[PDB]
Spike glycoprotein
Amino acid sequence: YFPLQSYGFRPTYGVGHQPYRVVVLSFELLHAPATVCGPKKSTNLVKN
Amino acid sequence: IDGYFKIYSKHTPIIGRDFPQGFSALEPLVDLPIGINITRFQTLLALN
Ligand SMILES: *[C@@H]1O[C@H](CO)[C@@H](O)[C@H](O)[C@H]1NC(C)=O
């Protein structure tokens, strides 16, 4: 048997058979210095 | 370093012919966090 099979997606198909775009986010643990962080910045200088 | 590769540099003008006797500090330029094994060192020469 052929290992690969065509999906044959059709709009008339049900929700379970409808195509779904899936993206998997993988996070690498701390083994090297961190290169990706989140954006954080607020407030002002407010002196004196 | 284990987590960084610190690089320090400085540009000076000639006073004399070669290796003048004087003091000049070395300002850092960039610290690449590559963290790899480094044992040998070889330089390059430009050929025109
Ligand atoms: C990196 O590899 C070099 C070359 O074999 C070795 O001398 C050095 O100990 C290694 N360093 C680490 C942290 O594994």
